[PDB]
Design a protein around this ligand. Structure first.
Ligand code: DGP
Ligand code: MN
Ligand code: MN
Length: 196
C-alpha cells in the first residue's frame, strides 16, 4: 500500500525535433549553428550517456552528448561514432558565454575531462539552482525535480537507460530517452529562472 505522493505520474517525453549527428565535422558545424542562435548568457539543457561496459579498469568513454537549445529542438551528438572529438562541440562546451544546465553535471565535467580532455565551462547544477529559487535544501535528482516542477516522471526502462550507448545507430527509444534528459534540464532551468 502506497500514498498518493507515490502514485505513478505521466512520463516526460520530448516531442520536438531531434537532430542526430554521428560525424565529427557535421557535429562541429551543428555546434556553430547553435552558437549562431544564442546570445551571451543563454542556457542549454545538457546530459551525456555512456555504455555500462568497462575498459582498461574504468567506465567506458562518454558515447553521447545531448544539448537541448529550446523547447522544440534537441541535438544528439553520438561522439562514440566519430573519428575524433568534434572541435565545434569542444568550443561550445568550453565556452563561458553559454551556460549548460543539468543534474550531476559536475560529475559529467570530470568524466568529460578524463575521457576527452575537454573542460566544461559555465555549467550549473540544477540541484543548487532549485534549492536557491525554491528556498529549500533537498538532494534533488533529475527525476525528483521533474516530478516536483512538472508533475511527470522520467522514462525508466533500465534496458534503455543502461543500454549500449556506443552502439551505432541509436534506436528510437534511446534517442527519446537521451533527448528527454537534456530537455528536462532546459525546462527545469527555464521554469526556475522566472521565479521571483
Ligand atoms: N573534484 C574532483 N572530483 C572528481 C575528479 N575525478 C572524479 N571526481 C568525482 C566524480 C564522482 O562524483 C566521484 C567519484 O568518482 P567516480 O569513480 O567517477 O564515481 O569523484 C577530479 O579530478 N576532481
Ligand atoms: Mn546524466
Ligand atoms: Mn541521461
Amino acid at each position: 500500500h502506497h500514498s498518493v505522493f507515490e502514485d505513478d505520474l505521466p512520463f516526460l517525453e520530448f516531442t520536438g525535433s531531434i537532430v542526430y549527428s554521428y560525424d565529427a565535422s557535421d557535429c562541429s558545424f551543428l555546434s556553430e549553428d547553435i552558437s549562431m542562435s544564442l546570445s551571451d548568457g543563454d542556457v542549454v539543457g545538457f546530459d551525456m550517456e555512456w555504455p555500462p561496459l568497462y575498459n582498461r579498469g574504468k567506465l567506458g568513454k562518454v558515447a553521447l552528448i545531448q544539448l537541448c537549445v529550446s523547447e522544440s529542438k534537441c541535438y544528439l551528438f553520438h561522439v562514440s561514432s566519430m573519428s575524433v572529438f568534434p572541435q565545434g562541440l569542444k568550443m561550445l562546451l568550453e565556452n563561458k558565454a553559454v551556460k549548460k544546465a543539468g543534474v550531476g553535471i559536475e560529475g559529467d565535467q570530470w568524466k568529460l575531462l578524463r575521457d576527452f580532455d575537454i573542460k566544461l565551462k559555465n555549467f550549473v547544477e540544477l540541484t543548487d539552482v532549485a534549492n536557491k529559487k525554491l528556498k529549500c535544501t533537498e538532494t534533488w535528482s533529475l527525476n525528483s525535480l521533474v516530478k516536483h516542477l512538472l508533475g511527470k516522471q522520467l522514462l525508466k526502462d533500465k534496458s534503455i537507460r543502461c543500454s549500449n550507448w556506443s552502439k551505432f545507430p541509436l534506436t528510437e527509444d534511446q534517442k527519446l530517452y537521451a533527448a528527454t534528459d537534456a530537455y528536462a534540464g532546459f525546462i527545469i532551468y527555464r521554469n526556475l529562472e522566472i521565479l521571483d
